[PDB]
Design a protein around this ligand. Sequence first.
Ligand SMILES: CC(C)Cc1ccc(S(=O)(=O)NC(=O)Nc2ncc(Br)s2)s1
Ligand SMILES: CC(C)Cc1ccc(S(=O)(=O)NC(=O)Nc2ncc(Br)s2)s1
Ligand SMILES: CC(C)Cc1ccc(S(=O)(=O)NC(=O)Nc2ncc(Br)s2)s1
Ligand SMILES: CC(C)Cc1ccc(S(=O)(=O)NC(=O)Nc2ncc(Br)s2)s1
Lengths: 317, 317, 319, 317
Amino acid sequence: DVNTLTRFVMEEGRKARGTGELTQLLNSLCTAVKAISSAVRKAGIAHLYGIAGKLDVLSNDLVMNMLKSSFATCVLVSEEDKHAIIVEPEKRGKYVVCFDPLDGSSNIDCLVSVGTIFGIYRKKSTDEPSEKDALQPGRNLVAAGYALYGSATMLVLAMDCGVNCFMLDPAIGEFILVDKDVKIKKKGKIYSLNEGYAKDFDPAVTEYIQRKKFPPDNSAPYGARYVGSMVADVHRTLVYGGIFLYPANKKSPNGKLRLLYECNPMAYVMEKAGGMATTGKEAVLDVIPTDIHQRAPVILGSPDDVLEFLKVYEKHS
Amino acid sequence: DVNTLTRFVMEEGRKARGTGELTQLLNSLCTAVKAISSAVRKAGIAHLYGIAGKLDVLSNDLVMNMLKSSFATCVLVSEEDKHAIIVEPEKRGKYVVCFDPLDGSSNIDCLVSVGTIFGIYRKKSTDEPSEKDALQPGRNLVAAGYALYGSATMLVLAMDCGVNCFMLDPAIGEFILVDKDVKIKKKGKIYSLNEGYAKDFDPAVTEYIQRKKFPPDNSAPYGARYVGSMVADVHRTLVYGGIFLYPANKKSPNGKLRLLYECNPMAYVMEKAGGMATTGKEAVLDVIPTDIHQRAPVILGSPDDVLEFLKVYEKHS
Amino acid sequence: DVNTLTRFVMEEGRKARGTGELTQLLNSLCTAVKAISSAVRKAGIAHLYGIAGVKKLDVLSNDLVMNMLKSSFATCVLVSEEDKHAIIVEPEKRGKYVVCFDPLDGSSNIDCLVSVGTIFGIYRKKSTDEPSEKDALQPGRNLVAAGYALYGSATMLVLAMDCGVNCFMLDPAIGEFILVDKDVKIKKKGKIYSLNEGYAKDFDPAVTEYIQRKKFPPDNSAPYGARYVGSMVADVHRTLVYGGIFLYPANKKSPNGKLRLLYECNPMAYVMEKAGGMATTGKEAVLDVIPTDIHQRAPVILGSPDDVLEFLKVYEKHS
Amino acid sequence: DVNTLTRFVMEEGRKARGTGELTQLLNSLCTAVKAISSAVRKAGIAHLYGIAGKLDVLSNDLVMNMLKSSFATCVLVSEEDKHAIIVEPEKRGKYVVCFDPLDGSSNIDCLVSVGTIFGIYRKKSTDEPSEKDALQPGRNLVAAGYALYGSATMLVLAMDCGVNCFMLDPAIGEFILVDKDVKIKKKGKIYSLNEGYAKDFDPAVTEYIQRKKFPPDNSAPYGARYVGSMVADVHRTLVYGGIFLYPANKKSPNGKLRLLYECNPMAYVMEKAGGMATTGKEAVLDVIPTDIHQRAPVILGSPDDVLEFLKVYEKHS
Ligand SMILES: CC(C)Cc1ccc(S(=O)(=O)NC(=O)Nc2ncc(Br)s2)s1
Ligand SMILES: CC(C)Cc1ccc(S(=O)(=O)NC(=O)Nc2ncc(Br)s2)s1
Ligand SMILES: CC(C)Cc1ccc(S(=O)(=O)NC(=O)Nc2ncc(Br)s2)s1
Ligand SMILES: CC(C)Cc1ccc(S(=O)(=O)NC(=O)Nc2ncc(Br)s2)s1
């Protein structure tokens, strides 16, 4: 029998005997994603060029407004805003949302894939809502996932019940369930990082890459892929398996990607699909943050691939 | 004034005082591109999953059927067909079209960007149409380009007048002109190739890539990008500058990419934009082919970068 | 703040403390309405004419509505204009609601691109017996929600429940029904009457007089305008938006009318009453007729209350 | 073989050895019609109702701007404009267009069908464009037709070669040919007019309608249909046969519909499909206009029905 995003969430909600507040949140976010998808594919661009005589800003406004108006949220952190946004009292609900409304949009000039990344927490302290409420470790996530605006638009939703993939059918504006309860390959054959920082790599990263190009067990070398847009690179890793790396360099001594709305959501999806995500020193989901725009190094993907890198890391003390 | 692809081609055609066959061909090609785009974005997928109780094949059928019914073609070469297709006599016109209807479609499960690549020639003899009519050197091209089905759908068209970029507005089905007479940066800061196969690199490729990462002076090392879909990587090279390599090695003395409907159309776009495209031994556009599916190595992008690669390449000759 | 159909129905459901079964039903029906809309607007018709080198629209609409309702797990008996007998939902998918619907009303003239629509009425099963066709034989008084989708110049969903009538506009760029008209009410009296005057030779004597009063008013005031699309959902929706009267009455050749009581007359009667209008057969209220056959017919006269009352006065004068 | 509007017009135009100005015109008009359809079906209305925090006017702006920028027109007459619009000198071409950009839009609150009506003339002087260029009789039309925004969107185009019907496929923004060289039924079973104004009827209109309800030859009476949107009522008459009336009476001796951009294009379509269109006294296409906004009565449809009406009309002298 056919299933949609809304219907899947309502049945999981009735199964868990919840109040419906989370369903209202997710229904609002998906409405936002459909408007973002339509703008990213350039519907109406002809009016901007005079047929009748900014995208990361628009995306941020769409997500902010649909979440506020859902009556289900209280604190909102966005890549686009210097401080956390506190929802007004008459619209407050019980959830905290960290999001990147249009990740990769700096290179959208070349029509690279871009995406929306989100992670949802229950507000945990009873204090008055503040920026501190978004500083929970990723272990605390209630739901997280992403929308990828690639050759098609897909919504990946990870919850306690697992990971599920929904394809936007733009003819009816419905997210159709196409892949149920997905799991990542135990081991893949692709590695992904920006090798232009090879001069600054720590010795452990240098060796691990060398093992991928020149395998000691004369097996086939890995192929390399690096789009430069995290949502595209992570989703390929989920669908095909392998490993994705963004380690620290001289320009970025604490790493480059953001912990709250880039690293933690992707780590949650990976673990719910049976994968891994580490900083080298610890699991990403175990890092306790102190600043909402703080950075972290990340190595994630199929479990056999992340484990092999951790052994090389251990060799270099 | 706002401009569309159909309006622009009509103006160039009336300017050159042509008969209109080339305009009919390009109009039919664009109807195919819009139908491919609609299917690539998964319109109507809900009916496939039972709401009421092939993509590379379909792309090929769309381009093939729209070209045959244009009355403007006589020989059609496609990546999908072993032999050249000869249009039935009642529908023959004067142009030869070589095309890849859905390049990158092998990895379409991960929603990577995909594309359609085409190059259009004038039939040169009055003999009866045969496969030989497609064996012209790239220098002979009348028009070439690609459609990128990325975060948005864009059509890039190169002719004698230069390179122009058109954005598909899906709300009305029109290609809107957004970048006129584009030129590539004289020197860039990005190199693009599959470094996972470094074990097999030609020694000149090894040394050249090492100089991008480890500059002998004190300039900044280049960044790395590799989507793995030719249309996406080539379009980024056009927009941002730099270099793209799919070179020859000892295991593949002729490269991997196909000359007729991958290498030549892209070489043509680059040269019309003030860039370069070499095999290492000569310009891609000067190769005279002997087989419709023959392969060729290609190194293309900003001219200062391509010239610097040839200096290292010649050092190892 | 913006509001959508799903968001609006979730709030009324949370407010009334329901289990969610009705919300799943309506959300499933709304998905079916978007797929019908997409097909009615001829998306993909290029493929039927050979661009790369199937079913009738009323069959496909029936298949879409039937399939989404079954898969909602919210229904047990389904009556459709297209099926001779009531459909009894299999046990593993049964819920507590009975739905009577016309999946594509007016579709016989869809060759001229006239407006077409989907009509629906939803009941709660009343007996504890095993579900059967009898469960669909309730009077209109018992309806829980009813409405229609009009596939016109735009696609709109009109939903009537106890809280009133609300109008939602389909935004095809994102596939959402956007709330655009809240708590709608019909004018007390209008300026348009709607019926097929081509069959006047067979008119009841009372229908002849009332129409005569509309064209040639005894107090030489201004005549009414006449409009008749011939598609019930379009004529009834115009009656709601502009006011006036719609007639499909009984005569000597057809003493019971022509329109179907369960899935045409009753749902339109319910919408009208919730918006402050009237709907009669001439002898009794549409919503009070007790049916004996799921495909039985009934005459209908509906619209603005002053207009329907003036008709009843003429009908009674002719005994 | 599949055919589209732009491909069909180019083929007829090359067949006639024309310069391409009319094709550039009709292609530009077809871009405006697709933009009007998109707005009429309410695409993007969510942004109007605040998701991120006029229609007849937009239609006139779309048609005016696409026609001006086509370089194919010099004078434009619109239902929305008091005086003719004169195209500025650098954009002038040789054609005159009379149009109603959104007919029936006064009742768009109830979502009744609406449409666009157009008629195209070659201009008259070689001097300078002026209003007089739009004052030609319907016999002079080069092409005319309408777009119906009903349950689907259809463009009906009549030229010298006949009447052809194109269905807009919104998934690709292309007009598909679906009914070729259409001809009307010789006699129908439906009459169409506003009977609420019967108190004002001409005696012949009264007698003719009486014959439809109470036939003297005891045959079956006709049915009645009246949408109130001329494009919808006229299109039903073409597809099903019958008669459509908006006749003269004492209060409106010249009718209500507009001659230049409502009566003439529909009269042309009817005659090209083998039907008739009269004022009662003469053929609509033979009226010579003196004012761009002058009115005329119209009776059109199947020939046996119009002849039967004229017989009653002639009996009353
Ligand atoms: C954690 C995941 C497996 C999904 C979820 C768990 C809880 C929720 S919820 O708290 O939002 N509850 C509801 O939505 N209840 C409803 N009642 C009627 C309807 Br119709 S849905 S979603
Ligand atoms: C190669 C570039 C300079 C562009 C082109 C050159 C030639 C053509 S063409 O041969 O196709 N000619 C036409 O299209 N003529 C037309 N006449 C009326 C219309 Br309306 S279009 S396009
Ligand atoms: C009074 C009528 C106009 C509206 C209704 C009455 C009953 C229903 S219902 O049975 O469908 N209940 C729910 O849906 N509850 C929900 N819980 C969580 C979510 Br989220 S919605 S709607
Ligand atoms: C009268 C109707 C039956 C159709 C028409 C007749 C003439 C025209 S025309 O003046 O527009 N000529 C062209 O369009 N020529 C072209 N050459 C190349 C291209 Br490609 S189109 S349309």
